[PDB]
Structure 1
Amino acid sequence: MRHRKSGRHLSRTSAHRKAMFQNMAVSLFEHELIKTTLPKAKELRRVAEPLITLAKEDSVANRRLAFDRTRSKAAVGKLFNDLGKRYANRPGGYLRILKCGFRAGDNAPMAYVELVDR
Protein backbone atom coordinates (compact mmCIF):
# COMPACT_ATOMS: atom_id res chain seq x y z
CA MET A 1 0.00 0.00 0.00
CA ARG A 2 3.01 2.12 0.99
CA HIS A 3 1.61 5.23 2.55
CA ARG A 4 4.61 7.38 3.57
CA LYS A 5 7.15 4.62 2.84
CA SER A 6 10.49 5.55 1.30
CA GLY A 7 12.91 3.51 -0.79
CA ARG A 8 12.36 1.41 -3.88
CA HIS A 9 13.07 -2.24 -4.54
CA LEU A 10 14.29 -2.27 -8.19
CA SER A 11 13.36 -6.00 -8.45
CA ARG A 12 16.55 -7.14 -6.72
CA THR A 13 16.96 -8.93 -3.42
CA SER A 14 18.23 -6.90 -0.51
CA ALA A 15 21.76 -8.29 -0.47
CA HIS A 16 22.10 -7.58 -4.18
CA ARG A 17 20.70 -4.09 -3.77
CA LYS A 18 23.14 -3.31 -0.98
CA ALA A 19 26.12 -4.58 -2.97
CA MET A 20 25.16 -2.74 -6.15
CA PHE A 21 24.92 0.78 -4.75
CA GLN A 22 28.23 0.14 -3.05
CA ASN A 23 29.60 -0.55 -6.51
CA MET A 24 28.06 2.40 -8.37
CA ALA A 25 29.55 4.76 -5.81
CA VAL A 26 33.03 3.23 -5.96
CA SER A 27 33.08 3.78 -9.72
CA LEU A 28 31.76 7.31 -9.42
CA PHE A 29 34.72 8.30 -7.26
CA GLU A 30 37.14 7.28 -10.00
CA HIS A 31 35.74 8.75 -13.21
CA GLU A 32 33.34 11.44 -11.90
CA LEU A 33 30.72 10.90 -14.63
CA ILE A 34 28.48 7.88 -15.07
CA LYS A 35 25.88 7.08 -17.72
CA THR A 36 23.33 5.12 -15.71
CA THR A 37 19.60 4.43 -15.51
CA LEU A 38 17.16 7.05 -14.25
CA PRO A 39 15.58 5.21 -11.26
CA LYS A 40 19.02 3.92 -10.33
CA ALA A 41 20.27 7.50 -10.22
CA LYS A 42 17.44 8.78 -8.03
CA GLU A 43 18.51 6.30 -5.35
CA LEU A 44 22.24 6.69 -5.83
CA ARG A 45 21.85 10.21 -4.46
CA ARG A 46 20.95 8.81 -1.02
CA VAL A 47 24.06 6.63 -0.65
CA ALA A 48 26.85 8.74 -2.13
CA GLU A 49 26.33 11.96 -0.13
CA PRO A 50 26.79 10.49 3.37
CA LEU A 51 30.20 9.53 2.02
CA ILE A 52 31.01 13.10 1.03
CA THR A 53 29.60 14.55 4.26
CA LEU A 54 31.65 12.00 6.19
CA ALA A 55 34.84 12.92 4.32
CA LYS A 56 34.88 16.45 5.75
CA GLU A 57 36.27 15.22 9.09
CA ASP A 58 39.47 13.20 9.04
CA SER A 59 39.74 10.53 11.74
CA VAL A 60 40.97 7.00 12.21
CA ALA A 61 37.42 6.20 13.28
CA ASN A 62 36.08 7.97 10.19
CA ARG A 63 38.54 6.28 7.86
CA ARG A 64 37.33 2.99 9.30
CA LEU A 65 33.70 4.04 9.00
CA ALA A 66 34.40 5.07 5.41
CA PHE A 67 36.13 1.80 4.53
CA ASP A 68 33.32 -0.28 6.02
CA ARG A 69 30.68 0.92 3.56
CA THR A 70 32.55 1.48 0.28
CA ARG A 71 35.06 -1.31 0.78
CA SER A 72 38.00 -0.31 -1.38
CA LYS A 73 41.40 1.22 -0.79
CA ALA A 74 41.32 3.48 -3.83
CA ALA A 75 37.98 5.07 -3.04
CA VAL A 76 38.98 5.81 0.54
CA GLY A 77 42.20 7.29 -0.80
CA LYS A 78 40.27 9.42 -3.28
CA LEU A 79 38.16 10.77 -0.47
CA PHE A 80 39.88 12.52 2.46
CA ASN A 81 42.61 13.78 0.08
CA ASP A 82 40.76 15.35 -2.87
CA LEU A 83 37.07 15.37 -2.01
CA GLY A 84 35.94 16.65 1.32
CA LYS A 85 38.54 19.37 0.85
CA ARG A 86 37.28 20.54 -2.54
CA TYR A 87 33.72 20.65 -1.20
CA ALA A 88 34.73 22.34 2.03
CA ASN A 89 32.18 25.18 1.86
CA ARG A 90 29.20 23.55 0.11
CA PRO A 91 26.12 23.01 2.30
CA GLY A 92 24.91 19.80 0.67
CA GLY A 93 23.74 19.02 -2.81
CA TYR A 94 26.94 17.57 -4.22
CA LEU A 95 25.69 15.94 -7.44
CA ARG A 96 23.40 16.60 -10.37
CA ILE A 97 21.21 14.45 -12.61
CA LEU A 98 20.64 15.30 -16.26
CA LYS A 99 18.14 13.21 -18.18
CA CYS A 100 19.44 12.09 -21.55
CA GLY A 101 17.26 10.28 -24.06
CA PHE A 102 16.56 6.55 -24.02
CA ARG A 103 18.43 3.28 -24.31
CA ALA A 104 18.49 1.73 -27.79
CA GLY A 105 17.68 -1.85 -26.84
CA ASP A 106 14.92 -1.21 -24.32
CA ASN A 107 13.41 2.13 -23.60
CA ALA A 108 15.18 2.71 -20.34
CA PRO A 109 15.46 6.47 -19.77
CA MET A 110 19.06 7.38 -19.06
CA ALA A 111 20.65 9.96 -16.79
CA TYR A 112 24.09 11.33 -16.08
CA VAL A 113 25.49 11.64 -12.61
CA GLU A 114 28.19 14.20 -12.25
CA LEU A 115 30.01 15.84 -9.38
CA VAL A 116 29.13 19.45 -9.07
CA ASP A 117 32.49 21.20 -9.55
CA ARG A 118 34.96 19.53 -11.83
Structure 2
Amino acid sequence: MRHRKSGRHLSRTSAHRKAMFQNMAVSLFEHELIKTTLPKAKELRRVAEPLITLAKEDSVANRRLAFDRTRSKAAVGKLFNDLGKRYANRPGGYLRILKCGFRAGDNAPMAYVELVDRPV
Protein backbone atom coordinates (compact mmCIF):
# COMPACT_ATOMS: atom_id res chain seq x y z
CA MET A 1 0.00 0.00 0.00
CA ARG A 2 1.11 3.53 -0.85
CA HIS A 3 -2.10 5.51 -0.38
CA ARG A 4 -1.53 9.26 -0.71
CA LYS A 5 2.27 8.85 -0.75
CA SER A 6 4.52 11.11 -2.80
CA GLY A 7 7.94 10.48 -4.32
CA ARG A 8 9.64 7.80 -6.40
CA HIS A 9 12.24 5.29 -5.24
CA LEU A 10 13.90 4.86 -8.67
CA SER A 11 15.81 1.82 -7.31
CA ARG A 12 18.33 3.90 -5.36
CA THR A 13 19.07 4.57 -1.72
CA SER A 14 17.90 7.90 -0.32
CA ALA A 15 21.49 9.15 -0.29
CA HIS A 16 21.91 8.26 -3.97
CA ARG A 17 18.58 9.89 -4.81
CA LYS A 18 19.42 13.16 -3.06
CA ALA A 19 22.81 13.45 -4.78
CA MET A 20 21.52 12.54 -8.25
CA PHE A 21 18.96 15.35 -8.26
CA GLN A 22 21.48 18.01 -7.26
CA ASN A 23 23.66 17.13 -10.25
CA MET A 24 20.62 17.03 -12.52
CA ALA A 25 19.38 20.42 -11.30
CA VAL A 26 22.86 21.98 -11.47
CA SER A 27 23.13 20.73 -15.06
CA LEU A 28 19.73 22.21 -15.93
CA PHE A 29 20.60 25.71 -14.68
CA GLU A 30 23.82 25.66 -16.73
CA HIS A 31 22.80 24.24 -20.12
CA GLU A 32 19.10 25.29 -19.96
CA LEU A 33 18.03 22.18 -21.95
CA ILE A 34 18.83 18.60 -20.95
CA LYS A 35 17.62 15.19 -22.09
CA THR A 36 16.75 12.65 -19.41
CA THR A 37 14.26 9.91 -18.54
CA LEU A 38 10.57 10.73 -18.14
CA PRO A 39 10.18 9.36 -14.57
CA LYS A 40 13.36 11.20 -13.57
CA ALA A 41 12.18 14.39 -15.30
CA LYS A 42 8.89 14.43 -13.38
CA GLU A 43 10.64 13.94 -10.03
CA LEU A 44 13.13 16.71 -10.84
CA ARG A 45 10.56 19.49 -11.06
CA ARG A 46 9.85 19.04 -7.35
CA VAL A 47 13.51 19.95 -6.72
CA ALA A 48 14.63 22.65 -9.16
CA GLU A 49 11.51 24.85 -9.12
CA PRO A 50 11.73 25.58 -5.36
CA LEU A 51 15.26 26.80 -6.10
CA ILE A 52 14.14 29.26 -8.78
CA THR A 53 11.50 30.63 -6.40
CA LEU A 54 14.09 31.03 -3.64
CA ALA A 55 16.37 32.94 -6.04
CA LYS A 56 13.78 35.71 -6.45
CA GLU A 57 14.76 37.43 -3.17
CA ASP A 58 18.47 38.24 -3.11
CA SER A 59 20.12 38.24 0.32
CA VAL A 60 23.13 36.79 2.10
CA ALA A 61 20.94 34.34 4.03
CA ASN A 62 19.17 33.26 0.84
CA ARG A 63 22.43 32.68 -1.04
CA ARG A 64 23.66 30.64 1.92
CA LEU A 65 20.54 28.46 1.81
CA ALA A 66 20.89 27.96 -1.95
CA PHE A 67 24.49 26.75 -1.67
CA ASP A 68 23.49 24.17 0.95
CA ARG A 69 20.95 22.54 -1.37
CA THR A 70 23.01 22.82 -4.60
CA ARG A 71 26.66 22.81 -3.55
CA SER A 72 27.85 24.69 -6.63
CA LYS A 73 29.29 28.20 -6.68
CA ALA A 74 28.48 28.70 -10.37
CA ALA A 75 24.89 27.46 -10.00
CA VAL A 76 24.28 29.77 -7.04
CA GLY A 77 25.67 32.62 -9.13
CA LYS A 78 23.67 31.44 -12.14
CA LEU A 79 20.56 31.88 -10.04
CA PHE A 80 20.32 35.20 -8.18
CA ASN A 81 21.80 36.87 -11.27
CA ASP A 82 19.93 35.53 -14.32
CA LEU A 83 17.09 33.35 -13.06
CA GLY A 84 14.87 34.88 -10.42
CA LYS A 85 15.36 38.06 -12.41
CA ARG A 86 14.11 36.38 -15.59
CA TYR A 87 11.23 34.68 -13.73
CA ALA A 88 10.58 37.52 -11.28
CA ASN A 89 6.98 37.98 -12.46
CA ARG A 90 6.16 34.36 -13.36
CA PRO A 91 4.04 32.53 -10.72
CA GLY A 92 5.59 29.09 -10.91
CA GLY A 93 5.96 26.67 -13.78
CA TYR A 94 9.52 27.67 -14.62
CA LEU A 95 10.40 24.52 -16.59
CA ARG A 96 8.77 22.40 -19.27
CA ILE A 97 8.78 18.66 -20.04
CA LEU A 98 8.21 17.16 -23.49
CA LYS A 99 8.21 13.46 -24.34
CA CYS A 100 10.75 12.67 -27.05
CA GLY A 101 10.71 8.92 -27.70
CA PHE A 102 12.70 6.01 -26.29
CA ARG A 103 16.34 5.10 -25.77
CA ALA A 104 17.89 2.60 -28.15
CA GLY A 105 19.78 0.64 -25.51
CA ASP A 106 16.99 -0.26 -23.10
CA ASN A 107 13.77 1.23 -24.58
CA ALA A 108 13.53 3.76 -21.76
CA PRO A 109 11.05 6.62 -22.35
CA MET A 110 12.91 9.92 -22.66
CA ALA A 111 11.93 13.56 -22.23
CA TYR A 112 13.23 17.09 -22.74
CA VAL A 113 13.52 19.38 -19.71
CA GLU A 114 13.98 23.07 -20.45
CA LEU A 115 13.41 26.44 -18.83
CA VAL A 116 10.24 28.03 -20.17
CA ASP A 117 11.59 31.31 -21.54
CA ARG A 118 15.06 30.58 -22.91
CA PRO A 119 16.19 33.72 -24.80
CA VAL A 120 18.00 31.49 -27.37
TM over 0.5: yes
Deviation at 1:67, TM superposition (A): 0.3
Structure 2 Cα separation of the partners of residues 68 and 28 of structure 1:
17
Matches for 1:103-114 after TM superposition, within 5 Å: 103-114=103-114
Deviation at 1:64, TM superposition (A): 0.2
Deviation at 1:9, TM superposition (A): 0.2
Structure 1 Cα separation of the partners of residues 25 and 6 of structure 2:
20
Deviation at 1:80, TM superposition (A): 0.4
Provide the TM-score with structure 1 as the length reference: 0.99
SS at match of 1:91: coil
Aligned counterpart, 2:49 = 49
SS at match of 1:113: strand
Deviation at 1:63, TM superposition (A): 0.4
SS at match of 1:43: helix
Unaligned 5+ residue runs, structure 1? none
Structure 2 Cα separation of the partners of residues 24 and 3 of structure 1:
28
SS at match of 1:26: helix
Taking every aligned residue pair, what percent have the same amino acid on both sides?
A: 100
What are the Cα deviations for residues 80-104 of structure 1, in whole angstroms up to 9, with x where unaligned? 0000001111010111100001000
Provide the TM-score with structure 2 as the length reference: 0.97
SS at match of 1:92: coil
Deviation at 1:77, TM superposition (A): 0.7
Structure 2 Cα separation of the partners of residues 18 and 104 of structure 1:
27
Structure 1 Cα separation of the partners of residues 3 and 82 of structure 2:
41
Structure 2 Cα separation of the partners of residues 93 and 114 of structure 1:
11
Structure 2 Cα separation of the partners of residues 5 and 77 of structure 1:
34
Unaligned 5+ residue runs, structure 2? none
